[PDB]
Amino acid sequence: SLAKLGEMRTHVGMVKRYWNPKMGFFIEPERKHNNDHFVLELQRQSLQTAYNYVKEVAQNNGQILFVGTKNDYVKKLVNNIAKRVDVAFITQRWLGGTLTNFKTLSISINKLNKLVEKQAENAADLTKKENLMLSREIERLEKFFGGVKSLKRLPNLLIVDDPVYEKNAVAEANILRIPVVALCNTNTNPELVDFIIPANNHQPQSTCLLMNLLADAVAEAKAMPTMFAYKPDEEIQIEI
């Protein structure tokens, strides 16, 4: 079934003694490992609620964004998934001043498209210096803000592995009343984020299957074939 407990054998504990007491309702008593373990039933209910919520909102084609900026493994998985399916994603950090205003994205994407069509119509007819420089800025800008060019409206929901790890972006989402899902570890505030998902990221399985499940939810919400919604096959991936 959805959000099954089969994969939840290594799903608890991310950090030790750096915790928020305001997150205690979503967790189970500690062990000698000092890892902040998670209740697997309340987490399952919250995951189901978030799944049906995102399914409903993205069936009407609500704008959804992806922000995964982990070191190499979760980042690579997000890159592969978001390249496979035509979805919006920003796999790099946030410098601010983008989510706040659509006017700060309209001109940016206009210039991006202008540079793309220029490079498509340029064949080193000018000096090699200008062509190489322009390609360099295109690659540099697209490496952060290049995975999203299909949006014409405001975002409606965000997905973040750890809000404190991207607090600036959270601030950019705090101005709007839009909801947001987050894999809060132990040190978050359940008032700046609407959906509370008690989960860890110290283990590959937890975060990878969470991200894949969200990706399949969004894909199926866009009238696409189902990939992982009730399958009991636990894909095996290790952090590397």
């Binding site: 919520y53 409903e56 909102v57 009407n60 609500g62 409606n156 009343r177 839009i178 909801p179 609407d194």
Partner: peptide
Amino acid sequence: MGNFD
């Protein structure tokens, strides 16, 4: 914001 509008 339970419903989408």
